[PDB]
Each structure stands twice: as structure tokens, then as C-alpha cells.
Protein: Deoxynucleoside triphosphate triphosphohydrolase SAMHD1
Amino acid sequence: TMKVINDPIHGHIELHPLLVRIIDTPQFQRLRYIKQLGGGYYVFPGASHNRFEHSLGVGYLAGCLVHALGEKQPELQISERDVLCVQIAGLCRNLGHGPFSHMFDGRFIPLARPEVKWTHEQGSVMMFEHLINSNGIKPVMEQYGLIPEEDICFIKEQIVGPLELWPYKGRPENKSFLYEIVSNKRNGIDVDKWDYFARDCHHLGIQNNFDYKRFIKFARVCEVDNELRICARDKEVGNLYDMFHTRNSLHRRAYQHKVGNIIDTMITDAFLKADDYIEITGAGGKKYRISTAIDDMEAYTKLTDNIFLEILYSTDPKLKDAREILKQIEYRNLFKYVGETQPTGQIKIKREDYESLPKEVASAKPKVLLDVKLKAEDFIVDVINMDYGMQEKNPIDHVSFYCKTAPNRAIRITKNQVSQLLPEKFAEQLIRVYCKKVDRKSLYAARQYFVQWCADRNFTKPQDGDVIAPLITPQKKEW
Amino acid sequence: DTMKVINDPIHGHIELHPLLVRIIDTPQFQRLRYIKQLGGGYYVFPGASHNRFEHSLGVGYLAGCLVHALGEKQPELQISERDVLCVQIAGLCRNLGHGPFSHMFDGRFIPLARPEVKWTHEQGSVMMFEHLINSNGIKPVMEQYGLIPEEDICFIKEQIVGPLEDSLWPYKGRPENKSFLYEIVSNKRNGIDVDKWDYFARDCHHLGIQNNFDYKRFIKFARVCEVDNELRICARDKEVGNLYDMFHTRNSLHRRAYQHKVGNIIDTMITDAFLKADDYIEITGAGGKKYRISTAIDDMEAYTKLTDNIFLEILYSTDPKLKDAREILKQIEYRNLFKYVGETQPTGQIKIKREDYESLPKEVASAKPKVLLDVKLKAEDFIVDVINMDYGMQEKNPIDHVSFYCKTAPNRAIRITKNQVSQLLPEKFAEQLIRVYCKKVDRKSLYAARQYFVQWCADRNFTKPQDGDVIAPLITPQKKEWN
Amino acid sequence: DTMKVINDPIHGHIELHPLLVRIIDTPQFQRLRYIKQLGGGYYVFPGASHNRFEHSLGVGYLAGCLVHALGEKQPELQISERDVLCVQIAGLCRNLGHGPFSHMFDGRFIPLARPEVKWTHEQGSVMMFEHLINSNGIKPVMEQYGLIPEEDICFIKEQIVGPLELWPYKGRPENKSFLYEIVSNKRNGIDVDKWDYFARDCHHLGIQNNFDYKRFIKFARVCEVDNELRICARDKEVGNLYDMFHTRNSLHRRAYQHKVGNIIDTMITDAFLKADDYIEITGAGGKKYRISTAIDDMEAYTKLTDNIFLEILYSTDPKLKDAREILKQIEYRNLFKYVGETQPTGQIKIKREDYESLPKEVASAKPKVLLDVKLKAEDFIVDVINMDYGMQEKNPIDHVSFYCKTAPNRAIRITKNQVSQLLPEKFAEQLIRVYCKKVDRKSLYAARQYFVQWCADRNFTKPQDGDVIAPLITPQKKEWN
Amino acid sequence: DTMKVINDPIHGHIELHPLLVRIIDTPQFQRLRYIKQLGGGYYVFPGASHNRFEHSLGVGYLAGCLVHALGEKQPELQISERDVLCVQIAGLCRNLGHGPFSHMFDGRFIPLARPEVKWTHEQGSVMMFEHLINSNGIKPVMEQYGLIPEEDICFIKEQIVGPLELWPYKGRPENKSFLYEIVSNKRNGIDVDKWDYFARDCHHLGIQNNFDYKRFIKFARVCEVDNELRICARDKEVGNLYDMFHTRNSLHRRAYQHKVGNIIDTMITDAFLKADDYIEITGAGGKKYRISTAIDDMEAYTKLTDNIFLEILYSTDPKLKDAREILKQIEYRNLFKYVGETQPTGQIKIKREDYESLPKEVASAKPKVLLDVKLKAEDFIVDVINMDYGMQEKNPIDHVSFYCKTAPNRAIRITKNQVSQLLPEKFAEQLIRVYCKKVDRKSLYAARQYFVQWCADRNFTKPQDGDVIAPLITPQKKEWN
Ligand SMILES: Nc1nc2c(ncn2[C@H]2C[C@H](O)[C@@H](COP(=O)(O)OP(=O)(O)OP(=O)(O)O)O2)c(=O)[nH]1
Ligand SMILES: Nc1nc2c(ncn2[C@H]2C[C@H](O)[C@@H](COP(=O)(O)OP(=O)(O)OP(=O)(O)O)O2)c(=O)[nH]1
Ligand SMILES: Nc1nc2c(ncn2[C@H]2C[C@H](O)[C@@H](COP(=O)(O)OP(=O)(O)OP(=O)(O)O)O2)c(=O)[nH]1
Ligand SMILES: Nc1nc2c(ncn2[C@H]2C[C@H](O)[C@@H](COP(=O)(O)OP(=O)(O)OP(=O)(O)O)O2)c(=O)[nH]1
Structure:
């Protein structure tokens, strides 16, 4: 029968027996050993939470929204089968995450395997297949009325989008709105964000401004260009703009914390140095590396935050370089933040150029006397793209609304119709510079290079530019 | 007498010095128990039962926390217990001047009842404070605890209302080396003060909407630095994001709650009821002389007895003089409110001034929608509510008026511009919302009101109301940009 | 007419069926906005500005949540939408009878103003409910949404005040017995009214609530018990139920019976008594009532709220000078002085009829201590407080039924010894507080001596500060030493 | 170096003195990031991902808050910056000795792996602290900030573990007696460790905390008690103190002793015992230790965290097959099945030595019913839990000193009867849980029969579900019914 789980964010969640079966597998329980915020725990000591409990919350909210829609609009013909498939997708869309979450797909794999293209979403689909097949889930699905052929396709499609006219095979256009719940490809407004906002805020000790319950109460399905889509009540548009404001705040303060990022960067370097030597046993006893475990789900099942400690506690001399980096983290001998700047006006920095940037900083020629000369290897340059989840675009332009006077007619709402105090831009870049040399004189020099580089490139004046580089800031007229 | 502890749901256990307790325990202060913080807001958010009294304790407490923290970190500032008590007193007393239903009273009622007068709750707070002190023999008690009333009462008043008037330094209660003290209770430079911090947390706790601003963090990062020969409060540079967020939070709370369309209309209805009852309700002031609702502000003894009670006095009256006033309140009880028609905004530069407000109903009634109508409405049937939404300094960016310090040189004050922070911030800092309502509540009247309204918007190149195509499908087509 | 959504800080977004909106938007309901939940408690806990109105929305909401959950889990219970609405209405309306300052009114004022009458807020709720219905044409609206007014009105009233006198109810039959356990549980006190106030009062007071009502709802089922269908709790939740009552008693100790909130309630009552001949309140047919007689006419009672406090405070009439002076003393915080607290060691406690004699008893004590000042009966207030688990000497958990996971529809009983030996051995007690109206130093000192001597004379418990406030008295009593 | 700010979800922004930061930034301290506060609890309450690291910061912070409050109010105590830092350090470091899965390690594993040893996390904390100080050159930093390591290190250790052995302490004299009451209160258990874990565990478990430590701090004073200067609480707070222990017992019942959390702890412990011959941990000089002997070497113990769980689970060595299989069963949620709970009746207490003979006893019971299967001693687990108010039979409040507002320098005692007759009459009890290693339907049915029979045979209490799980057995015992 059903199980009750007490969650600090959602209170008492009811789990259908089929969901319990999916949960109680090595492939799912794995997520207990992957921190939701990775290196962030090393800055925010409340952020101990893992992918596992977040996944439960996502499945729960996915269920709440689909339930709400069915109760309010029985004409949608939403079935218990539909509800379960949506809950399963919600539960399983985090299955693909690697050690320290975004660090793994965002930092490590791009450097370890630049040729490969890999995302946690792809991983989630693969792990899900592995989970299903390894645990005899399909029989249990039919026992509760699911049709594995169609429904597994549907679940995968919810996580990763078309496995490619209506492009989906798992459900038809009349059920289009179902695909907006777990992972919303159209505008990013989905139950995954709603759980991490509330869960991260609870753990970080910073407050959440977004009311998902409210949103759910005001959600309706309407016909939009011959699709049935979820529409928000007109008056909730303010709150949706705010939801993305909240997202960006959480990125600024927490997910892209300058020191959290530097720790992620150091752990990634440790992983790269360990990658030749750590071995992970996959299917048939075959051995994989940290970087290649993603090619075999049996191996990947055993790849979690544990690697951090395996490296730290290692005695093998081959792992000395990797282990040393982690030990510096324990002593808190971290690379030093020098400053932040941004490109001015039009300019954007391409991913291909990231590598050249430490060279550029080291090449700057501040007109000041320096005891030390710094090298490209002494600098880290971290480039972060901050947006509203659709690059340059406004996601609210891709939301449909209804008004109380005509609940069946979907409408659009433009930014001008809402507020002139809203962002005029929806994407930006932040550039952080750090120095691996931590002494007083080194650090002083790093500041001079940095601010000179900013001037040379016509980037924005660092906020403390006049303090850290008083001789340099005057040369640039704009500043 | 000794220190008291009070449990507050927002701040926990608040200790109060005996002099503060003496000030609190007066008719002039306790009056604030009978004035709702959000006025007509309570009639939309049922949790907003809170009053100005408990907010005032919170402001006093926070004012003390900040001045105390500064003193602990920088003993060189020479902050005295006397300075601390004066700051707390000002914090405690800056809300004394509020009238019935708070902003309703100074924002809606007095401007209509007595357009010749200029009145603000801030001026009221000063007058009430003076009335409190004089009426209760507080000056002697102040000197008992080492305060110097001549300097200190001046200092307290200046903290609430600003310089009592030119000059580099316009304050008389304290010198430039204590300038940072004037930034705690009521910050005239940029509006970052402990009053905001209390109502964000308190209103959110009561409203059931979450607060994004962390005042405790702010206090930990705050320092005093020399700026143009003043000692001012500086925030850590890194916190500039959070300060922009503070004003964003303020704006959210205004949008969602303080300017809720229905809460506003209820305030308007209560105001009308007061205007109708103004001739008949009698309030006894100094010497037994009698005042009206609109004139109690001229005598603080009378003003002391002017609270939300007038609402119930009107509601429960039987005198036929008050029948009209009472009927409006009764319509509030049955929820037969004036009906919301819609909201629009002026586009681009355009702004509507205070002086124009009265001509607006006539304008809407003058618009000529090319639609057959069952009924024809008149100026009197419309209410037009203009709302100013800003960052507290009209078109100005308050963050341009903030001083920061950096960790490498904690005594050196600097400035941070918007470009130095983010491109995702607002490019403007002020806008206007125009709400239209109709006093005729029948279906046919409402339908007509919608047509006049949307036509008016179009005629004047205001923004398309969000529901424009639903409420006025025949009108919206004529304006091309809309559709 | 459509459903409304309301945002509550305790429950979030609450859906209100249009029939409930029609009930709410009446003078009789909206009245509750002007009655503080905790009365004079707000004068001690400044966060406790909340009113009976918002508490009533919460009770109506919780009542709905419970009956919906029961119906979803056991469709064989045959719960109807009609049932759901009637239970929500009863929940919304069980606080309608409350008077100015809530429990002050029925607990202190009415007993003293009109000792001959017997009156409770519950009786008031039923009367107001009838007045609300009749004055606003609600009966037709009830039938529009499928209710049967005659039966359902009876059902709602029974839910609030019990049987209007085998099966004693007329509104519903034995098969729906469990519906009577939701709003106002006469069997054991476990109902949704407590659950809202625990959470609401804690939120506002700023003290923490240890009870999880949502958990309770998730684990609740209906089972047959002595040929009645009753709400049963999961066996393992029994500890949590004991904890609920423990929490209730804590809230009484810390907040609802706060020694100063109680003396403020007493002072306001004294002002009301002194104003009651002069305040006039117009009821039906233009007839005039007093504060103490407005309870006989609902039209008058409709206009009787916390407002009277201010009507007195702001009065200029000389007749109200006495009443107005007491309220002024409250403002200056010149309150009656708490002397101390004690409890009876003996069983059988103290009669309500005996209360009047107690100040005289204190004044008649003869402490062997040097006193400058002699006090009189009239100088003392003696406030007797009954603290229990809701059922006098009885354990409410003995009147709860449970089910186990291996047999969810079978009811069982659980005894205290099956749960823990850390639980209470008694479930009722009395606190006695003494105060003095003379607030000078010498008077207070004297009052302490009489008090402690009276405790001794009566074999009450030694006040906690007894050795400090009455060092000459406490040594006489050997038990205390 | 300058002060650091840390954001904690429980306490908000915590200021850390440079010296404390130096202590925190060591492998010995950072180790606490990898030990779950609640061990096996995380596997039942998914919010309880929190680790000992963040709890230890909180304890350090609250230790500072108390000592700072006392110093501000009573400057005559002569409390020094040195005293404050020492109290904070002891608070920070009193959890250093915890092992994998916290209480599992010292409460279950070590007692079984090393029955000869007497080992407490407190002893471990003192050893780790020594290691931390010596390995990281902290003593020079201590003197840089004015500390005197010989006295102050002794004082810190004494705060954690008590006298390292008439005034028995050497780190501070009698005049500073009260300082030894903040971090680890040996007199009555009222200390800042509990205050952080109540609030932190509640925040993460998703259950409510009823104790207000900030209130307690505000009302705390130091008074002379029998020639010692001790921390005293305001008299009126006594209710809140009883409630603090009530809350602790509720947390244990609901969470720390959850039946499934406990069985998971038990399973993990077995896995560790089976891996103990084969897991190696490198300590000082490259030498290798076992899980059971890492406690002997601090360098090894440093690297002994919850990680061993995953090292075993991910292992391929066939010698670890048995240990790895137990952990794999946990992942599949194939746990030992809860059969039931009972308690000893009246007088009886269960001895530590007898724990191992209990499964044999259950298997020896002869239930008079037809059974498909016969079970053996090895198929049963019996878990005995001692629940109390921290001082076995004793009432901690009998060991607390109070003051009253009329004489704040005069310490007094308050007895239970002076407070409430609704309090516990007993302060310790035992709970006995039985589980079955055979999880099939027939086996579980049989296990229920043996269990209830065993309860009857030993005159333990009737399991709450006894009539449902063993309807044929419960009849025989008259007392039960
Ligand atoms: N909030 C709260 N949560 C609890 C309490 N006791 C347990 N929980 C949590 C732990 C779990 O996450 C969830 C379900 O725990 P239960 O003890 O109800 O489940 P369990 O499977 O052990 O009971 P069963 O005997 O199988 O029905 O609730 C409680 O007293 N209060
Ligand atoms: N959080 C919490 N607050 C309480 C409790 N008891 C009272 N309060 C609140 C009510 C007040 O706002 C504040 C002070 O109440 P007290 O009873 O300590 O002050 P009171 O003047 O009655 O005591 P006194 O005998 O004059 O020291 O704390 C409690 O147990 N917990
Ligand atoms: N949490 C939250 N509550 C809100 C917000 N806006 C309004 N509320 C509260 C006030 C009310 O208690 C409740 C319903 O307010 P609404 O403005 O949504 O309904 P109203 O009847 O004004 O609009 P409608 O009739 O749907 O046009 O929600 C918001 O953004 N967040
Ligand atoms: N509540 C809140 N906490 C924050 C925010 N930013 C950072 N924190 C947390 C993370 C840490 O636990 C703690 C200190 O963060 P900071 O960014 O002030 O420290 P950091 O050492 O990076 O600053 P530094 O540049 O060294 O002064 O506060 C924020 O905006 N809000």
C-alpha cells in the first residue's frame, strides 16, 4: 500500500506503491550520495542536502499539479495512469547527476572529455532505463495499469524532450499540457525549480520569494494554437517575473558564489588529476574511469561524491597531486579572489576563448612598480552566463494567460503591460578573476594586472577598483 | 524601575530600558494598538490584523541593534548610552503620527477633507511626541537617565522629520561626527532604514508572503566611514546586490499587498464614509473644545483619541445624520464594493500629477467607444486611482546615494554605479499605475464602464489593459500596436 | 457567484465555496474581525493582534480538509458534498457567539454581571447562526447548492452545541456519527478548532507549536466502535495525541493564563461592570440593551465587540468616569499587583460558588509578622484557574479509538501504561493567583504576608518564591521546610 | 586574520573569531562534514541530511551567546575574552570524537567490536582535540590571542569530559565554576549542545521544536550556591525547563529511536562487524588500522567517517561480500521486519549483559497455535532502549537552581509539587523492540506469535496491536483481557 514520508519542505508526502518500488533501487538511492549544491556546502554549511530528497519533492509537486488540473477540469480526461507517469518522471529527472551535481556536467566532463557532448538529462534517461531493466519494473507497471511501451517513452520524453507535426510519441496533442509539468522546454517554468527554490532556501538560510501553491491554484489548461497548454491567471504575471528574479538571486548569492565556484574549480582539478588512476567496475567486471563511467550505467551507479573522499584518504603516490589539492581545501588554503567585472555594451565572450583569458590577464602591463611578476598559470578566470533560462529571451513572452472574465480564452501579456521597472535585458556575463599565489605582494600584483586588463578591454570598473588599484583607475576616462 | 523583556514574533525577546518603557506606557503611544498597519489591507489579507504599536516596538529594537553593533565594532566612534537611547526613542516614536487606517488617513482622507492644509504622518509624529513628553512629565525622567532634553529632543525630532529648517550640516541635535546616527531610523539620503526592515518582516509574517531581505546580515556588514567630512554608515561593496533586492522586495509588497486593487477600493470607501461623517463625529480636545475627524490633527489631545474606532463608531451609529456614512460601511460588510474596471499605465516618459487627479473621472466619462450601449455613465460614477511605484526617491536610483567600503580598505568609502552591478536591473526607477472603478455595480453598467475605460486608454496611448481583448473586444482592434 | 481563494498565513491558500462566501459576507460574520482571539493577552504579547474572524476561516478550512480526507480514503463512508459543506459551515460558525475579548466575556464578565443567567459562547454561536441565516436569506442559497435547510441547520447547530434535547442527534444518523467529531468533539476534545488555534496562536504569540495536525489527518480513519462509526487514530500516533494535550496545557500556562494577561482581563471586566448601566446598544425594534443584556438580542449582540473598550476610554460622560479611569490605569500600566500563585494539595479543588469568599479568607489570615498596613477583602483579587486535559479528572486518550496497520478498519483501545510511564498521573489541577489593588510598596509587602499565611492556613503549596517574599511565614510550616 | 561570518539556517549570521577559524580549518574538524548527525535516521527522515560539522558550529556559537550574556549582565563575574574564547572552543569541539553515523558508532558498534573498552564520543573528542592542536600548530596562535595553553587546554578538555582526574577542576577556580555549566552540564544536562540539536534536528526532520533557548539565556544569572558560583534560571521558567526535557523525550521517541532508523543502524553495524577484518585505514607512520581500532590512533580516526559505508557498498573484494550484501539489502529496502514493541512491567529493568540471551528467549517461547515455520534464535533481533530525562531515575529539575525577581541574587530550589501535578511521576523507562530476519509472510506471522507469547511469558506489557497480530495468544493472559 501507500507510504507516507515526512519532508521538511512539503510535510507528509504520500507515495504510491509503484513509486516506492522505483525509489528502493540502487540506481535511485545513489542520489543520497550526491549533494544538491556541490561545493556550496563548503560555503553554506546548511546546504548538506542531497539530490535524493530533492527528487522526492519534485515527484511530489509533479503529482500535485497534475492532480489539481484534473480536479478542476475533468474534461481533460487525465487518468491515474497519467498521474503516475508524471510523478515517475518528476522523481527521475535528477537520476543523471554526477558527483557534486552541476560541477560534474558543468565543469568536469567538459574538460575531461571535450569531444563528447553530455548532459545530466541524457544521463537521467539512461539511468532510468538501467533502473527499469535491472529491477524488473515493467511487470509492476502493468500490475498498476501502465502500458510500458507508451509510458516509458512518455516518461523519457518528459525528462529529455522529443527523442526526435507533434513530435512526441508518449502522449498525443490533447495531452500536450502534461509535458509542461516536469521539465518545461518552452519557458522553464516547472516543478523542479519550485522544489529547489524552497529546499535550497530552507537549507541555505536565505528566504524564498516564490509561492508555487498559489501558482497551482491559478493554473488552468486552455487551447493555445491547437494545443492544450497550461495557462496562468493574468494577475500571476508579476509573480512569474519575480520567480525568475528569485532564480537569478539564488544564482548570484549561492549557486555562483565566488568561493563556492573556486572550490568547485579546485575539486574539478583534483578529479582531472585523479582520472587516470581511479578505476570503477562496470558491467561484466570491465573498468572505467571517472570520465568514462558515464558510458556504462552499472559503473555510473557507483560514482558519487564518494570519489572526493576516496581521493582524500588515498595513500597511492599516483594520486599525490590530486590528494594534495583536496588537502589544501581542508586547510582552507584556497586560490584568492581578485575581483569581478563584466563586458561592456555589446560584448560577449565565447566558450572557445575561455582558455586564452588567464594569458590575457598575465599579459597586462600596469604602469606601477611590482616586486613580483605573475604568470598565466597563477590566474583563474571564471566566466559565468547569467540569464532567465532562455539565453537572450524573456521566458514570460513564452507563457500563456487567461482572465477571470473568459477562462477558456488564452492570452499573451507583454512586458510593457506589466512594469517599466522590469529588466530591459535577460542575459549577462560575469567574469571572476582569482590568483593561485596567496602572499601579500603577489596578491597586490594580481590586483594591478586585473584592473589593467579590465581597462585594456573596456570591461566594467571593478567595484573596489579605486581602492585596490588607485594608480590604474584614473587612466581610464570612462571610470 | 528596571528593564523589561517583551516577546515579539518577528524579533524574539526584546529588552527595553526603563525610560523606553515609560514612554511606551502613555495614552499617546498605546493609541497605536488601535491603528492597523495596513488599513484596508486586512479586508483582503485576513492575517494582516497587526497594528502600528507592535511595528513601533520593532523599529525601536532594530534601531538599537544597529547603533549597538556599530559601537561594538568601532569604539572610536564614541557612541554613548545617551546616543543609543535617543535613537531607540526616535525608532519607537516615528509612527506616532499615524491616523486611522494608517496611510489612508494622510494619503486619501485629509487631502480631500482639508485640501488647503499640508499634513503628513511624519509631522504628526513630531507633534505627538512633543505632546507625549509634555503630558506625561517625561523631560525630568530623561535627565534622570542622563539625557539632555534641549539637545536630545531636538535630535529625536530631527531623526523623524529631518532638519527642522543653506549649509553643509543642517542638524542641531548632533554634530557631523555623529552623522551616521541620522541614517538609522529615518534615512532621508536613500531610505535604507530600520523602519523598512521591520515592516518587511512583520507584514510578510502576517500577510503570508515571504520576505527576501535579510536585515541582520546588513547590520553585520555595516561600518562607519568618513564621507565629505561626515562619518556615515557604509555597506560592504559585495552587498550592493542585496540592496537592489531590498527595493525590489519593497516594490513586490506594494504590488501584491499595499496597493492591492480591492484593498485600495476599500480604503476609498472608508475615506468616503469619513467624509460623510466628518460634520457629525465629535472629538474632545484641549479645554473640552470639540474637533472633527478632519480637524483633530490640529490638537494632539484630540488626535490621541482618533483611531480605527471611528470606523466602528460610524458603523454602529443609529443617528440618522450618520445614515449615509453608515450605509457605505454596511456595503463594505456585505462586500458590495465599487467595481474594478481595469488598470493601465502611461507609456514611456508620461506622468500624471497630483493636481490632475480630479479631472480624470470626467475624462473617462467623455471617451466615446464606438459600441452600442444599454446605459450611459457619468463622471461621478467613476473612480480613478493613480498609483506611484518607485524606489522611494521618485525617478532617482537610491543606490547612487549609498556609500560602500571594501574588505581591503575598510575605512575608505566608495561609490558603486548600476553598470558596475548588473544589466538585469531596472533601467527606470519610477512608474505609474492607473486603476479605474465604477460605483454602479450592475452588469450593464460594468460592461459600459469597460468600454469607456479601454477607449480612454487607446485615445491616450496608455498601455493595453491585460484583459483588454476580453472585456472590450470591439475597442482593442482600433489600436494597432495592441492588435 | 463563484468560489474565492483567500490567503492565510497559517494555511496558505484556502478555497471558499460560494455558499461559504455568502455566510462570511454578513454583518454577523464580519463582526468577528473586531474580537481579539486572546483578549487582554495582546496587552502582554504584542504579536497577538489576531481576531476571531481569521481563526474561524481557519477552522472552517481544517474541518473541510478532515472530512475530504476521510471521504477520499474510505468512499464506503458515503460522505457527500452536502456533508462537506455542512461541516465547513459549522467550522466557520462555531466562534460566532464570542463576545468582546473572547473568553473574558463569557468567562468573567457575564458570570459577574448576570449571575442568574447561564450563558456560553456556544449557545451564542447557535443564536447568531440562526440570526445570520434569517437576516440574510441564506436558506434559499443552501438549497441551491443541494443542502436540505431543516435537517442541515439542525446538523450545523448540533455540531456546535451538541444534542438539542441511544442516538441523541437529529441532523445526521449513527452511520455518520464521525462527522460530529470534526468541529467540536464532545467525546475527547480532539477537533479542528484546537488545531487552528495552536498553529495560529503560536504564529502570533511567537512561541512554538509541537502538534502536527496534518500528520494526524493523514493517519485518521473511520472505524466501528460500540455500533458507532468514529474517527480513529493510528495506534503509533498515541504519543502524538498525548503531546497535543501537553501542548494545550503549555499554551494555557505560558499565554492564555498569563498572570498579567489575566489581571488585564480582570481590569477590563471591572470597567465593563462600571460602564454597563450607561452604555446602550440598539437591538431589534429599536429596543435598547446593555453590554450584559445584548446577549438576549442578536441584532444588538451583532454590534457588541472590542469597540466597547474604546467607547468607554474615549467617553466624556461623567457617568462613565469610573469605568474610563480603570482603562486609563491600564494605559499607564498602573495595574493591580500580582502577589503570587499557589495550588491546592487536596482533591475536589474549589467550587465556583466559593470564589466570592476567597478574598475575605486572605484578608482574615493572621500572619505573625510586623505590618504597618491592614488590608481588607476588597483589596484582594483571587483568580482560580482550572487546568486540565479537557475532561476534568479524565484522561481524554482513554476516550480515543485506534487502529493498527495489519487491520485498518478494526478499532482498538490503548491504555496509558501501554504508552509510557513518563506521562501524567493526574489530568486536572487548579492554580490560584492572588493580586492586590493597592500598589504601594508597603501594601504589596503586606499582601505577600497575608497570602503566604493563607496558603499555610489552607495547606496549599508553598509559593515558589515563598521563602523570599515571606521569610517569617514559611518556616512555621514543616511540610514546606 | 580577521573575523569571519558564516550563514547558518538555524542561527543566522555567526561571527567567528580568527582563532576559532584556525581550529575549524583543519582535517580533524572538517572531518565532521562527513558524519551524519542522525546516522541511520536519514534513511527514514530524508530531511536529516545534516552533519556533525554544522551542529558543532552552532554549539560553539550558543556557548558564546551564553557566556557573553552572563558577562554583560554581571560584570562582577570578571568574565574575560580569554574565558569567552575557551568556552567557544569547547563548544565547537565537543563533537570531534563522533564516529561514522554518530551514535551508532559509540552506541552500537564499539560496544560489540570492543566490549572490553570503555569509550565515549566525549573521550574521543578530547583525544582528537589534542591531535588537532598538536598537528596544526594551534598553541602559538592561542598565545597570540592571549590564551594560556597549559591552563586553557586543560579548561577546554575539562568542559568536554569533566575533571581529567574538593574543587576537582584545574583549568579554572571555584569563582569561575559556572563556566563548566555551558558546554556539557554534568549537574543536570542543561547545556548549549541540546539547544542546537533541538532546533537543528527539528528544522531538518520537519518536526516542531518547543524549547526557546534564547529566552533561557535572557533569564540566566549567576548566583552563589553552596559556595559555588552557578548558573541560575528565573523561577517562572521552571515550566519551560520541564518542557525542554519533554521535547527531548519526544525527539527520541519520534526520531532518534524510530523503529526503522534503529534497525537500519543495526544492519549497518553488522556490516561493519563483518567488514572489520578486511577494511584498512591508514594511520600514523603508514600503519594500518581497522574500523574497531581507528579509535586508538587519531590520525586514522581522522579518516574514519560515513565514507566506510560506501567503501563497503562499492567494494569488489569477495571477503567483503557478506558485509556488502547487508548494505545492498538496505538499498533494496529488504530490511529486517519490525515485529513489535513492549515494555517491562513495574519494577523490571533489563540488564546489559542479558541483551544477547534475549533472542534465544523469544525463540524458546511456545505459542499454542498452528505454524508453517519454526524460527530460531538467530532469526530474531531484540533492541533494548533506555529512555530517560538524562539522569536515569532522577529528576533533573531537582538539580537546578532558581532565582526570583524580588531577590535576584538569592538562589532557591523548586520541587516538582510546587510546579504542576500534571508532570511525569517517573523519569526513566525501557522500550523493547523485536525484529525478524526472515521477511516472508509465513515467517512474519510466526514471529508475531513468538513475540506476543514471549511478552506474556515475561509479563511485559501487551503490544498495542496484540489482539490483531496474535488474536489466539492474547486471550491466555488475563491482565490483558
Ligand atoms: N512529523 C513527524 N514525522 C514523523 C513522526 N514519526 C515518524 N515520522 C516521519 C518519519 C518518516 O519520514 C515518515 C513516516 O514514518 P512512520 O513511522 O509513519 O512510517 P513507518 O514505515 O515507520 O510506519 P508503518 O509502521 O510502516 O506504518 O514520517 C512524528 O511523530 N512526527
Ligand atoms: N516565548 C515565550 N514568551 C513568553 C513566555 N511567557 C511569557 N512570554 C512573553 C510575554 C511577554 O511579551 C514577555 C515577558 O513575559 P514575562 O511573563 O516574562 O514577563 P512578566 O512582566 O510577566 O514577568 P515579571 O514577573 O515581571 O518578570 O515574554 C514563554 O514561555 N515563552
Ligand atoms: N501569497 C500571495 N497572496 C496574494 C497575492 N496577491 C493577493 N494575495 C492574497 C490576497 C487574498 O487573501 C487572496 C486573493 O487575492 P487575489 O488578489 O488573488 O483575488 P481577488 O479576488 O483580488 O482577484 P480576482 O477576483 O481573482 O480578480 O490572495 C500574492 O501575490 N501572493
Ligand atoms: N543570507 C545570505 N547569506 C549569504 C549571502 N551571500 C553569502 N552568504 C553566506 C555564505 C556564507 O555562509 C556566509 C559568508 O559569505 P560571504 O560571501 O560574506 O563570505 P566571503 O568569505 O565570500 O566574503 P569575503 O569577500 O571574504 O568578505 O554568508 C546572501 O546574500 N545572503
Observations:
- Chain D has two domains: 1-334, 335-481.
- The first strand of chain D starts at residue 4 and ends at 8.
- Chain D touches chain A through 42 residues (CB under 8 Å).
- The radius of gyration of chain D is 25 Å.
